[PDB]
Amino acid sequence: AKVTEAPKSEKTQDRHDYQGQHQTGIVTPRPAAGMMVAFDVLASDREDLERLFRTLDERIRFLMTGGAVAQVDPKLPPVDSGILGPVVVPDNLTITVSVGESLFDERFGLAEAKPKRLSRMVGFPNDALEADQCHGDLTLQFCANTPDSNIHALRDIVKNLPDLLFVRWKQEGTVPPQAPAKPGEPEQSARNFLGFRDGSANPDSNDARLMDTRVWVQPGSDEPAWAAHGSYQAVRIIRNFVERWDRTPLQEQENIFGRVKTTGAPMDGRLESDVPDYAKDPEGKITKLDAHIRLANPRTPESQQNLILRRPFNYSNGVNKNGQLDMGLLFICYQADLEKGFITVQTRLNGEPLEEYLKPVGGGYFFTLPGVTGAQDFIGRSLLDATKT
Ligand code: HEM
Numbered sequence: 001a002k003v004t005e006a007p008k009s010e011k012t013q014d015r016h017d018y019q020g021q022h023q024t025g026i027v028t029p030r031p032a033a034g035m036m037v038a039f040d041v042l043a044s045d046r047e048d049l050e051r052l053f054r055t056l057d058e059r060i061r062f063l064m065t066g067g068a069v070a071q072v073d074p075k076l077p078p079v080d081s082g083i084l085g086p087v088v089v090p091d092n093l094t095i096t097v098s099v100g101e102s103l104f105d106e107r108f109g110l111a112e113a114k115p116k117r118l119s120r121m122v123g124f125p126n127d128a129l130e131a132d133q134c135h136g137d138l139t140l141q142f143c144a145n146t147p148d149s150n151i152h153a154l155r156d157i158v159k160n161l162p163d164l165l166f167v168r169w170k171q172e173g174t175v176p177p178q179a180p181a182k183p184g185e186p187e188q189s190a191r192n193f194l195g196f197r198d199g200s201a202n203p204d205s206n207d208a209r210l211m212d213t214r215v216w217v218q219p220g221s222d223e224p225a226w227a228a229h230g231s232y233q234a235v236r237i238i239r240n241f242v243e244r245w246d247r248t249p250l251q252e253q254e255n256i257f258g259r260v261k262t263t264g265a266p267m268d269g270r271l272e273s274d275v276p277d278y279a280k281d282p283e284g285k286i287t288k289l290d291a292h293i294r295l296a297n298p299r300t301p302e303s304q305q306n307l308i309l310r311r312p313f314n315y316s317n318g319v320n321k322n323g324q325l326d327m328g329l330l331f332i333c334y335q336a337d338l339e340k341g342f343i344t345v346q347t348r349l350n351g352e353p354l355e356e357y358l359k360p361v362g363g364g365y366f367f368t369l370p371g372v373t374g375a376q377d378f379i380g381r382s383l384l385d386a387t388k389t
């Protein structure tokens with residue numbers, strides 16, 4: 001009724017189990033709001049590094065559950081920012097912790113336990129990387145139903161870790177919610193800021209064995225033993241030239257991607273779940289040879305080792321000086337091998353016709369730590385236990 005009255009939400013009690021073999025926020029169903037924040041660790045020794053991960057585990061445990069946060073002593077600063085009121089609600093919140101290559105340098109003595117393919121992001125030919133938006137010691141992926149819940153969670157982290165963490169860069173994004181599909185039917189993949197369904201050909205996140213071979217680091221693999229059940233995280237802040245894209249004919253938009261815009265169907269199919277048959281189209285008349293999906297996934301037995309699980313968000317910043325809207329895709333994908341995953345796929349995508357409307361400006365390579373298995377475990381414990389003494 002009244003203007004400033006808060007909107008009503010029925011999803012404030014949405015929750016996800018923080019514990020598990022894997023961290024949440026990868027195979028977890030993606031909510032409407034996301035945020036990636038990169039940090040630099042200011043720990044002076046191993047004692048401070050241990051306190052950082054223990055404090056991170058304690059705060060994420062509470063933020064992903066909720067509880068009373070009213071400061072009963074007004075002489076002290078409030079324990080909570082108060083954005084969600086005196087009682088914190090979960091609101092589908094998940095926080096995923098990933099570490100970068102710079103965390104495994106001379107500073108912290110973790111160099112021995114570095115994952116094999118964890119490296120520093122090198123600029124691709126179409127890139128225009130901004131130094132203040134790249135790399136970092138650590139990333140925290142915030143995902144919730146609303147951006148305010150993510151901001152409240154980021155407020156909590158920096159309030160409880162003001163000296164051990166330095167905020168490097170951040171990017172918030174959303175995905176457009178849709179009306180519920182027919183009862184018992186799967187929803188469509190959310191659309192990006194280019195108007196296309198994004199995530200249709202993603203590998204089945206419900207297929208556990210497929211996620212074990214392509215997304216999750218398996219025990220017994222060549223990676224260090226502590227890194228089992230982890231995953232490589234690739235972040236790319238890609239700017240969309242939306243004015244020139246909206247001037248492009250629809251047939252050109254679909255030829256560039258290889259998918260019908262409205263239905264999300266391939267050039268030789270009818271449904272979004274359909275996949276193209278490149279064996280029947282060797283010369284690329286139905287699906288162009290330089291199409292986005294054809295270059296990213298040629299659908300050969302060798303290309304199967306390059307599958308990636310994408311989890312992007314649509315981000316929108318301000319406006320530049322010549323009048324163009326600064327908006328694009330917060331690209332996030334996960335893979336058991338970063339070199340085999342995003343790095344090989346992006347190498348195939350170098351020179352694609354989609355680059356006419358793309359401009360990557362930030363991001364980095366990080367390794368998502370394995371999940372917290374029990375109450376006596378905490379995030380990064382297996383990494384700290386692998387580098388003891
Ligand atoms: C920058 C690195 C990117 C990588 C590594 C990547 C990777 C992929 C992969 C693996 C697929 C699956 C294709 C298939 O299996 O047939 C795909 C499809 C697709 N991508 Fe990307 N992509 C990137 C950037 C983008 C950007 C910037 C957009 C902007 C709109 C985009 C939009 C799409 C669309 C619409 C599809 C088809 C729907 C789908 O199958 O998800 N991609 N991409």
Ligand SMILES: [Cl-]
Pocket residue numbers: 019020021022
């Ligand atoms: Cl699990």
Ligand SMILES: [Cl-]
Pocket residue numbers: 160161162163164165
């Ligand atoms: Cl601190």
Ligand SMILES: [Cl-]
Pocket residue numbers: 170171172
């Ligand atoms: Cl932002």
Ligand SMILES: [Cl-]
Pocket residue numbers: 188263272
């Ligand atoms: Cl549909």
Ligand SMILES: [Cl-]
Pocket residue numbers: 320321
């Ligand atoms: Cl500018």
Ligand SMILES: [Cl-]
Pocket residue numbers: none
């Ligand atoms: Cl312990």
